[PDB]
Amino acid sequence: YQVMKRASEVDLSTVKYKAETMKAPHLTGLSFKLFVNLLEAPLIGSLIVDYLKKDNGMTKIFRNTVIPEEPMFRPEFPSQEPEHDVVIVGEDESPIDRLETALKCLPQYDPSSFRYWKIRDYAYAYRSKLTTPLQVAKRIISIIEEFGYDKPPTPFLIRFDANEVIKQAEASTRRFEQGNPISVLDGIFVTIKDDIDCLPHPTNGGTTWLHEDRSVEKDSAVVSKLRSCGAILLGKANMHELGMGTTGNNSNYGTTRNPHDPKRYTGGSSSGSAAIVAAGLCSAALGTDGGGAVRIPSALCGITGLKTTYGRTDMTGSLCEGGTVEIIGPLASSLEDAFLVYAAILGSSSADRYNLKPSPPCFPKLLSHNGSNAIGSLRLGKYTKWFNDVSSSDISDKCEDILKLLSNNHGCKVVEIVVPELEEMRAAHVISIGSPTLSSLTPYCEAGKNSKLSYDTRTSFAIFRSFSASDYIAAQCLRRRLMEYHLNIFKDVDVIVTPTTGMTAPVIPPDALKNGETNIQVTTDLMRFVLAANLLGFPAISVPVGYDKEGLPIGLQIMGRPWAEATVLGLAAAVEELAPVTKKPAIFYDILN
């Protein structure tokens, strides 16, 4: 008749890892266009969705279960104990002044197996006049215009003004010529995801029409901070439409291709951001993360993806401002670059500063000795059955070796944990991320703009329109239950270590390049370890940790306490020291030559 719960009284020794996935068929092309038209049909549209939600256990959780907890509408973080061995940075400081402190937290720069270029490598080359930002911009523009990375069918960028990039590089070159560069980011090329505002480009979020209904008159908070440091905004990256996807498929501009294997997906939704950084075209990129959209493509393309704490970074000037799960984080080819870009874009909005009361941001002392005893004192939380729940055995073993290696060189202790109610976490997250997305686009869809969206988005919107208001309340009660679980886990361990994704980069079905696809079995394997950071606001970083049988990159996820970015950055720095990215992508471009 009904089920009952209680979260604070759950016996943790009786929690059982439920390992059934979300079953669904795999439709493509012509068989993908008609069934979407059935979902948009008046009568049978609701009947199909009501059956789908009733078969994957969503009606039982939402409408047949008495949840005793009160709704937690946004991540409510208690006061955290202060971190150990960090450098506190002022809450009211400029991005230039924070980069000066970040450089002090890095090991001494020593210009001495394949390796990506670092931001400090570009920065030293500019100051040694070995090259100039204008010359580096010409090389990038040449690599974009010859292979068509700003054009269909396989673009890194969907908005690119080469003449605008030259203007910034000319101003950056003149600053180095006069010997007064702005910061370490002066001349560094940063790509912006298409759901973040960056002048003079419009914002479409992967659509073809959003610029008509939503205009852009100023930069976003992150782009304004980057631009003030001297960074060169390259353009708007391709993405899965409106972030409603985890593969990167785009029926409008084409699917961005993985630099390791162009026949495979990059991961979503920051497809163009991760791919243009994995290919080495630019030093770093910015992307949004509502359901792993920063860490998922970072794992499948073999780069670093930092998902910061909710509210840590001002999202003003993006398509997901006002949401309860999304953040804006950096994507870079190394921990040092990811830590530098984070140092520039961080800072809460005025409203979030009051509503969330974040602790002053700190930086990790990446310079070990006198360090690496704080790393060894960290307790690593491992949910073994959750850890081993991967498609290929190579991923669980490659990440279990890092946990093994971290204990041999530093002394870290791996603690067996249990994360209860993972199925509830999926249900609570899908409705928490879809409801604000559909609400901010409903006036346009009602105006006839719904047809201009892709079939992959219209499939999600069809399911989103079936969510009632009472379902949202119940889901926020579940968000409190999972918050209490994770806050008690962080009373024992300091981080929760998992693989970032359950599978490596999947190949693109050729019938999916026509007008998208719908493969839940793949999107489920990709969002298995990332939802806890979005629903509960925790910071999570995806660090590469090697490759599998087919040489595809594997990433490890380090999820820490609220506002504990320095801990997840210092641990990932020790991880990448034991597992450096050594293989070169199939698609790669060596600028600075």
Q: What is the CATH number of the domain that holds 154?
A: 3.90.1300.10
The verdict on 448 and 552 lying in the same domain is no
The verdict on 329 and 473 lying in the same domain is no
The verdict on 42 and 130 lying in the same domain is no
Element (H, E) at 496: strand 495-499
Residue found by looking up tokens 């140092």 in the block = 343
Handedness of CA 51, 53, 59, 60 (dihedral sign): positive
DSSP, collapsed to helix, strand or coil, labels residue 413 as strand
Which residue type does 38 have? L
Q: How far apart are CA 475 and CA 426, in angstroms?
A: 10
The verdict on 356 and 463 lying in the same domain is no
Q: Is 138 exposed, middle or buried (0-12, 13-18, 19+ CB in 10 A)?
A: middle
Q: Which of 434, 461, 480 is the last residue of a domain?
A: 480
DSSP, collapsed to helix, strand or coil, labels residue 192 as strand
Handedness of CA 514, 286, 237, 195 (dihedral sign): positive
Residue found by looking up tokens 């830590």 in the block = 339
Contacts of 200 (CB under 8 A, 6+ apart): 161, 164
Tokens, residue 317:
């000037």
Nearest to 229 by CA among 167, 287, 171: 171
Nearest to 430 by CA among 572, 245, 593, 200: 245
β-partners of residue 556 are 499, 543
Residue found by looking up tokens 């497809």 in the block = 271
The verdict on 449 and 561 lying in the same domain is no
For the chain, how many structural domains are there in total? 2
Q: How far apart are CA 16 and CA 383, in angstroms?
A: 11
Burial 160-195 (b: 16+ CB within 10 A, else e): bbbebbbebbebbbebbeeeebbbbbbbbbbbbbbb
Domain of residue 558 covers 91-422+484-578
Resolution (angstroms) stands at: 2.8
The verdict on 306 and 200 lying in the same domain is yes
Q: Which of 455, 480, 505 is the last residue of a domain?
A: 480
Beta strands 379-382; 413-416: pairing state = parallel
Q: How far apart are CA 431 and CA 476, in angstroms?
A: 9
The verdict on 472 and 495 lying in the same domain is no
Please give the angle made by the CA atoms of 186, 97 and 87, to the nearest 5 degrees: 120
Which residue type does 139 have? R
Handedness of CA 311, 312, 315, 319 (dihedral sign): negative
Structure-determination approach: X-ray
The verdict on 452 and 492 lying in the same domain is no
Q: Which of 448, 464, 480 is the last residue of a domain?
A: 480
Give yes or no for a cis peptide into 420 (omega within 30° of 0). Answer: no
The verdict on 183 and 39 lying in the same domain is no
β-partners of residue 498 are 557
Element (H, E) at 86: strand 86-88
Contacts of 538 (CB under 8 A, 6+ apart): 309, 486, 532, 559, 560, 561, 562
- Neighbouring CB atoms inside 10 A of 78's CB total 7
The verdict on 428 and 572 lying in the same domain is no
Helix, strand, coil share (%) of the chain residues, nearest 5: 40, 15, 45
Decide: 562 and 75 in contact? Cβ < 8 Å.
yes
Q: Is 101 exposed, middle or buried (0-12, 13-18, 19+ CB in 10 A)?
A: middle
Let me know if residue 254 belongs to a domain.
yes
The Cβ-side half-sphere exposure at 152, using a 13 Å CA radius, reads 10
The verdict on 36 and 180 lying in the same domain is no
Contacts of 440 (CB under 8 A, 6+ apart): 319, 322
The verdict on 137 and 173 lying in the same domain is yes
